[PDB]
Design a protein around this ligand. Structure first.
Ligand SMILES: CC(=O)O[C@@H]1[C@H](O)[C@@H](O)[C@@H](O)O[C@@H]1COS(N)(=O)=O
Ligand SMILES: [Zn+2]
Length: 257
């Protein structure tokens, strides 16, 4: 099926998933000098105090840290969002080298990685229903650059040895997503899609201006993961990012001047 190799990578996805060439695809390049400050945007509200992490899973495309979303325990509100969006999982996209790995780019600049905190609009009752709606999901994107270590990331790094291959999962309770946020919540926002098949156009993207720093040792451990299942020839999980797609008829709004 789909992946990030030469023979099944983003260039091929449109054949099985025609929406790949659709009206509102992600990610995009964020041209900082074309984005429009929008003084009408309300403050962004990240409410993660009651967040309940459950499990970490290698799904053969990335790794997901999953949360209990049966109640409003960890939510995103405000900014461009109407109503309440519940945290369901977060994951990363990253490169084989520090100079690439992010999905969104900022004035064409690629970061070493990008964290995605995925939330679904509670008005639609469940995640499966939400992805079929133009405002079903809100994904908070955060760039990673290589610098000093991120202490709040180390617990994730530590457990990767136990989910090396596709299908593996481990208990991952009492992790606090707040440790992954930068100081500033200044952001750009635009209407887009999931960046992997099924590429559904159901996402309000909120991409933070300020990157977090992680250490070389930390990102190196991401790169030791496998796309393949246990017992199969080793394919390192690297460069699991879709490149920037055409902006087409969309505007990127900024929360700041
Ligand atoms: C919400 C979701 O579909 O996440 C999926 C996967 O579970 C995830 O592991 C990763 O591959 O990105 C995907 C695409 O989502 S993303 N990049 O749009 O935010
Ligand atoms: Zn993602």
């Amino acid at each position: 099926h789909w992946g990030y190799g030469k023979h099944n990578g983003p260039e091929h996805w449109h054949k099985d998933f025609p929406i790949a060439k659709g009206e509102r695809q992600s990610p995009v390049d964020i041209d900082t000098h074309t984005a429009k400050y929008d003084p009408s945007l309300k403050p962004l509200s990240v409410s993660y105090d009651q967040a309940t992490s459950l499990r970490i899973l290698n799904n053969g495309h990335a790794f997901n840290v999953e949360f209990d979303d049966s109640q409003d325990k960890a939510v995103l509100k405000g900014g461009p969002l109407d109503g309440t969006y519940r945290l369901i999982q977060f994951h990363f996209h990253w490169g084989s080298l520090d100079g690439q790995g992010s999905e969104h780019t900022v004035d064409k600049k690629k970061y070493a990685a990008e964290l995605h905190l995925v939330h679904w609009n509670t008005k639609y009752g469940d995640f499966g229903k939400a992805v079929q709606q133009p405002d079903g999901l809100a994904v908070l994107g955060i760039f990673l650059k290589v610098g000093s270590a991120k202490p709040g990331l180390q617990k994730v790094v530590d457990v990767l040895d136990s989910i090396k291959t596709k299908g593996k999962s481990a208990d991952f309770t009492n992790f606090d997503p707040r440790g992954l946020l930068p100081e500033s919540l200044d952001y750009w926002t635009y209407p887009g899609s999931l960046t992997t098949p099924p590429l559904l156009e159901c996402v309000t993207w909120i991409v933070l201006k300020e990157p977090i720093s992680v250490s070389s040792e930390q990102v190196l451990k991401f790169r030791k993961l496998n796309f393949n299942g246990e017992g199969e020839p080793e394919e390192l999980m690297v460069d699991n990012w879709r490149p920037a797609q055409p902006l087409k008829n969309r505007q990127i709004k900024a929360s700041f001047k």
